[PDB]
Structure 1
C-alpha cells in the first residue's frame, strides 16, 4: 500500500506558466552555475511567465525583493501577493541579476506545489543518489495512472474500402486497418 513518511518535501511549484525547482548542488554542477547561488531553477516557462521575459534556465532569486531560496518560501511570497495583478521578479541569468515584471489581468494567484511522483518499492532511481527515497517520494501503487497513458497503443480503426488516406504512406491498408467493404 501507500507509505508516506512524516516529511515528503516539495519538488516543484507552478506559477503563472513558470515551473520552479529547488536549485540543488547537483543542478548547480549540471548547469555550471555558481555553487553558492541561492534561489529556484526555472526549468520551464510559458504564458505570462514567458511574456515577462523569464526563460528556462533562469534562477529565481526574489519576488518583490523578498529572497526566495526554497519552494516553501516562494509559495509564501506568492500567497502574500496572490491577489495582485503584477509582481517583480529578480532573476540570475548568465551572471547578471535582472528584474522582470510578471503580470496577469485578473490576479497572479498562489503558486501551486507538488512532490516528486509516487514510486513502486522496486522502481529504479533515474537520477544520481540524493538520500533515502522516502525523504522525497511516497511509496505505493496509486500516485499516478499506470499503465502510463503515454504508452498505451490505440488500434487504427476499421476503414471503408477506398477511404482517403489522411496520413503519409505506411503500407497496405489491411496491414493495419480492418477494411469495411
Structure 2
C-alpha cells in the first residue's frame, strides 16, 4: 500500500530548528501577506533558529545573500554551507527586511525535506483544494503508523488499595482503576 506519483514535491524543510514551507497563495491571503512576495514561510522556530532572532510568521527570503524561493533551492543552499557554523538570514517581517545570523558550535548541516504524508484512497481533505491529490500525497497505507498512537487510550492501570493520588480528584478510584483488594 504505497502508490507514489512521478512528481511528489516537498511540503517542508527543517533546519537548525525552523520548519520551512512553500509560501502559497493559500497562505499569502491567509496571513494577509503581499502576493508578490517570494520566499519560504517559517511557521515553527525552536532551538538555534529561534535563538538567532527568527520568529514564526517570518518568511525566509535568502541565505548568505542567495535567494531562496523554493524548498529545492533552499536545500541546494544548505548543502553549500552545510559545514559552516554560521550563515546569514535575510527575512521578511512586517514589511521590513531584517537580517539574522544562524549558529551551531559543531556545524549547521543539511536542511532535511519532507513530503505531504501518505494518505488513504477514501481520506478527507482537511484543507482548501490545492490540485490533484497524487501531486503532494502518496496514496496507500504504508508510511502508516496506523492507528495513530495519539488515538490509542491506555487503561490507567491497577493500583494497590490506599495508593497515593498523583493526579487531581477525578472521582471514585474504582471507576478507572483496577484496585488490588
**Bucket of the pairwise TM-score, normalised by the shorter protein:** over 0.9
SS at match of 1:55: coil
> After the TM superposition, which segments of 4 or more aligned residues of structure 1 sit over 2 Å from their partners?
none
SS at match of 2:28: helix
Aligned pairs (5 A) from 1:90-105: 90-105=90-105
Figure out how many residues of one structure are paired with residues of the other and give that number. Answer: 181
Structure 2 Cα separation of the partners of residues 144 and 9 of structure 1? 19
Query: Which deviations, in whole Å up to 9, do the C-alpha atoms of 1:107-156 show, x marking residues without a partner?
Result: 00000000000000010100100000000000000123111101100000
**TM-score, normalising length: structure 1:** 0.99
Query: Which deviations, in whole Å up to 9, do the C-alpha atoms of 1:48-101 show, x marking residues without a partner?
Result: 000000010000000000000000000000000000000000000000000000
SS at match of 1:174: coil
Structure 1 Cα separation of the partners of residues 32 and 10 of structure 2? 24
Q: Does 1:166 align with 2:166?
A: yes
Structure 2 Cα separation of the partners of residues 58 and 125 of structure 1? 26
SS at match of 2:167: coil
In the alignment, which residue of structure 1 is the partner of 2:107?
A: 107
Q: Name which of structure 1's ranges 140-149 and 76-85 shifts more when overlaid on structure 2.
A: 140-149
Query: Which deviations, in whole Å up to 9, do the C-alpha atoms of 1:13-38 show, x marking residues without a partner?
Result: 00000000000011000000000100
Gaps of 5+ in 2: none
Gaps of 5+ in 1: none
Q: Name which of structure 1's ranges 29-38 and 138-147 shifts more when overlaid on structure 2.
A: 138-147
Report how far residue 12 of structure 1 moved: 0.2
